[PDB]
Amino acid sequence: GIEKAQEEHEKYHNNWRAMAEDFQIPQVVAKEIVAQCPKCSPKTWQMDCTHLEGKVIIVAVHVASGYIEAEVLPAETGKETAHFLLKLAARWPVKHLHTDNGDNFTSSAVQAVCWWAQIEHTFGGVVESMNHQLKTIITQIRDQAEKIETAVQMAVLIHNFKRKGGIGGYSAGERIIDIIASDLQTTKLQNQI
Amino acid sequence: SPKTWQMDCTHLEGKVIIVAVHVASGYIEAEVLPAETGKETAHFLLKLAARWPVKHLHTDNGDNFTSSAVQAVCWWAQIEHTFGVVESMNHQLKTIITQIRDQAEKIETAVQMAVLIHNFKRKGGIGGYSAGERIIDIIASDLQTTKLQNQISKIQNFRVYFREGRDQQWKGPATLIWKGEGAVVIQDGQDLKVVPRRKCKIIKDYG
Amino acid sequence: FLDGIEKAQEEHEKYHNNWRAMAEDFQIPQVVAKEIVAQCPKCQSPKTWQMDCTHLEGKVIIVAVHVASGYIEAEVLPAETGKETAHFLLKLAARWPVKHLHTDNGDNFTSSAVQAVCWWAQIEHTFGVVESMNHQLKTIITQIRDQAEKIETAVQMAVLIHNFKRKGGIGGYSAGERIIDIIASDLQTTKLQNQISKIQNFRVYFREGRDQQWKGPATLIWKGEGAVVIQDGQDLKVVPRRKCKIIKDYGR
Amino acid sequence: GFLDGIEKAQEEHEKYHNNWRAMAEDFQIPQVVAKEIVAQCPKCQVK
Numbered sequence: 262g263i264e265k266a267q268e269e270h271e272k273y274h275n276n277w278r279a280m281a282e283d284f285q286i287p288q289v290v291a292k293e294i295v296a297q298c299p300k301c302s303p304k305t306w307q308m309d310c311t312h313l314e315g316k317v318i319i320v321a322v323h324v325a326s327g328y329i330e331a332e333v334l335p336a337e338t339g340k341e342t343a344h345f346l347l348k349l350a351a352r353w354p355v356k357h358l359h360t361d362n363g364d365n366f367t368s369s370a371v372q373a374v375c376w377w378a379q380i381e382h383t384f385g386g387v388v389e390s391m392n393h394q395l396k397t398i399i400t401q402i403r404d405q406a407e408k409i410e411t412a413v414q415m416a417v418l419i420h421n422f423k424r425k426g427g428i429g430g431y432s433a434g435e436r437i438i439d440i441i442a443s444d445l446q447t448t449k450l451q452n453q454i
Numbered sequence: 455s456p457k458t459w460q461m462d463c464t465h466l467e468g469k470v471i472i473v474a475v476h477v478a479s480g481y482i483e484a485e486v487l488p489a490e491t492g493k494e495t496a497h498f499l500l501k502l503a504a505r506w507p508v509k510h511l512h513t514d515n516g517d518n519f520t521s522s523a524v525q526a527v528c529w530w531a532q533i534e535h536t537f538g539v540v541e542s543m544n545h546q547l548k549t550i551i552t553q554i555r556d557q558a559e560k561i562e563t564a565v566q567m568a569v570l571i572h573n574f575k576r577k578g579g580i581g582g583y584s585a586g587e588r589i590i591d592i593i594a595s596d597l598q599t600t601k602l603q604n605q606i607s608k609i610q611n612f613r614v615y616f617r618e619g620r621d622q623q624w625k626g627p628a629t630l631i632w633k634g635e636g637a638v639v640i641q642d643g644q645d646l647k648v649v650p651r652r653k654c655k656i657i658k659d660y661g
Numbered sequence: 662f663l664d665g666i667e668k669a670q671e672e673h674e675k676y677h678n679n680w681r682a683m684a685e686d687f688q689i690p691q692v693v694a695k696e697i698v699a700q701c702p703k704c705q706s707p708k709t710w711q712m713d714c715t716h717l718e719g720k721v722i723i724v725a726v727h728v729a730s731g732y733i734e735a736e737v738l739p740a741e742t743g744k745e746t747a748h749f750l751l752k753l754a755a756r757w758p759v760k761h762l763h764t765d766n767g768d769n770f771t772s773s774a775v776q777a778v779c780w781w782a783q784i785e786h787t788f789g790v791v792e793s794m795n796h797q798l799k800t801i802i803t804q805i806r807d808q809a810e811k812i813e814t815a816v817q818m819a820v821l822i823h824n825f826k827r828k829g830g831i832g833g834y835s836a837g838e839r840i841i842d843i844i845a846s847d848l849q850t851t852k853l854q855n856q857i858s859k860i861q862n863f864r865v866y867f868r869e870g871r872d873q874q875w876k877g878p879a880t881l882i883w884k885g886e887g888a889v890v891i892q893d894g895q896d897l898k899v900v901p902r903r904k905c906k907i908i909k910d911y912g913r
Numbered sequence: 914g915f916l917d918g919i920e921k922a923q924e925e926h927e928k929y930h931n932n933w934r935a936m937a938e939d940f941q942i943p944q945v946v947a948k949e950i951v952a953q954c955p956k957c958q959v960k
């Protein structure tokens with residue numbers, strides 16, 4: 262397996278995650294294989310903010326499964342963004358946060374919450390598709406509720422558990438639960454063996 | 455039961471906190487309410503129903519738990535609502551709140567940090583798991599059972615055109631059972647047989 | 662059966678699902694589910710390609726990218742005249758189903774040869790992703806340049822590494838699996854639409870219970886072995902076969 | 914072939930409004946295309 266991984270990286274220069282999945286090697290050997298080349302994540306969340314009918318809607322998307330979590334913000338300050346990030350860290354395990362070079366995400370309160378929750382905060386074609394799909398669902402079920410908050414939460418529910426599309430035919434919640442369960446069993450068997 | 459949630463409310467520092475607990479694994483989601491009306495209670499129940507699969511809810515005979523807005527949200531999300539652990543979780547949450555009070559300025563920061571500490575930083579139990587690992591494992595096992603029972607027929611909904619010994623005509627569309635590495639098991643006219651891999655064509659045959 | 666149809670109608674009224682999810686969950690045939698979807702007033706591309714020309718080490722490379730999945734087919738031209746561009750477009754239209762081409766306002770893209778190729782292959786040509794794919798392809802070309810003697814070998818090996826080795830996206834699939842799944846879904850949609858029209862060219866006279874009279878002409882949806890699904894009064898219902906007369910309808 | 918027969922049947926039904934069996938026996942087209950020619954007329958009705 263190790264010779265197959267070395268020949269595959271010498272031929273096509275694969276990343277360490279695909280080699281660890283396809284050749285069944287622990288991740289430290291694949292990391293050293295990629296690090297020894299001269300030519301050369303289930304817990305990553307991307308954040309964004311948008312506007313809709315004068316309100317500010319903050320959207321956090323889990324990337325490897327397509328999971329959504331949205332909220333209505335009364336303002337675009339830093340304390341409310343830090344509170345939403347604290348609630349997101351208190352609900353799901355967050356290890357790597359991806360954002361844009363903004364003003365509210367670059368704040369002392371949000372950096373204090375990131376330090377207390379031990380999250381790697383990084384600044385930099387999936388999130389635009391997620392926001393566009395959320396906008397189409399919001400325009401679909403707008404007339405079933407009065408305020409925009411109930412419409413946002415019902416759009417989150419429909420996007421999470423009522424859209425069984427894609428190649429596998431799986432919704433977002435079942436995908437993120439199966440991914441984190443398989444990653445937990447993989448880390449357990451690697452810590453045991 | 456893997457899909458039963460219970461709810462309760464309490465007071466702290468002049469505020470009103472509402473705590474919802476997944477019972478089978480001890481998973482706490484808590485929020486700070488600015489009022490005790492039915493609108494924000496149904497809004498919190500809608501956020502809980504949008505984040506996690508809630509199929510059965512158990513509450514008490516309160517004033518905000520008996521509301522037409524809560525009935526409308528439960529009808530829209532197809533929730534079986536019953537009237538009647540959470541006190542022990544409230545005691546644990548208040549002790550953690552008093553433990554790390556000195557790092558939070560407001561009250562909601564201390565509440566959400568206590569929720570994070572109780573969810574991911576208190577490893578106990580029998581196997582030595584936290585609460586998030588327990589709820590993820592329970593829901594994954596139940597979904598694996600139901601999806602297995604559907605995927606058997608989903609893989610049996612295919613068609614196989616096979617070839618037999620010393621006959622140059624492709625036979626009819628027998629039903630696939632299992633596709634091995636070098637052998638294919640098919641069912642043809644209530645007769646199970648095994649053909650090699652180089653003598654079969656597997657189509658879904660839209661038409 | 663009828664309980665499943667009424668549950669699917671209430672579910673589509675609430676949440677506005679698609680027809681595949683309802684046909685898999687509620688155990689109804691796909692023609693009835695597509696009928697329920699098509700009767701919604703609030704519920705109403707896999708064959709588009711982009712072309713580009715670039716320069717690399719004194720040669721002229723031409724890249725054609727399938728947009729909906731990111732599928733790159735590249736070639737090396739001897740010159741930048743119109744005839745070799747028309748020949749590459751004819752090869753691309755011969756291997757993959759192309760129905761809409763998106764190009765820029767170049768000179769060799771505006772020629773009688775490209776116009777005759779688009780006329781013979783029936784392709785809608787539109788003059789205005791690709792820069793990002795060109796950046797990724799040129800980084801891969803500069804990554805594995807030393808393993809090839811000429812430039813065309815490095816170009817084809819970079820196309821292979823980009824198509825079948827680099828994995829990403831939501832589920833972690835490559836580009837070839839995405840284009841094959843998208844085209845297969847389009848094929849399933851076209852076959853089901855042909856079956857829907859061929860069944861919907863009929864008419865049904867139905868007779869209600871405790872009445873010896875025939876009612877109005879309801880449109881047939883799905884003809885089963887014991888049950889018959891009809892549409893009447895903007896409503897779907899299931900009538901048994903012993904109370905129905907299926908006749909041909911000439912109503913163009 | 915009877916493709917010119919189909920064109921002449923369209924012209925003849927546009928003028929005189931024949932029925933389907935008459936055109937199928939005169940112009941020697943099959944009965945399905947003659948019934949479709951009668952079916953496409955908004956004033957006629959196949960009977």
Ligand SMILES: [Zn+2]
Nearest residue numbers: 274298300301
């Ligand atoms: Zn390398």
Ligand SMILES: [Zn+2]
Nearest residue numbers: 677701703704
């Ligand atoms: Zn609809």
Ligand SMILES: [Zn+2]
Nearest residue numbers: 930954956957
């Ligand atoms: Zn006529």
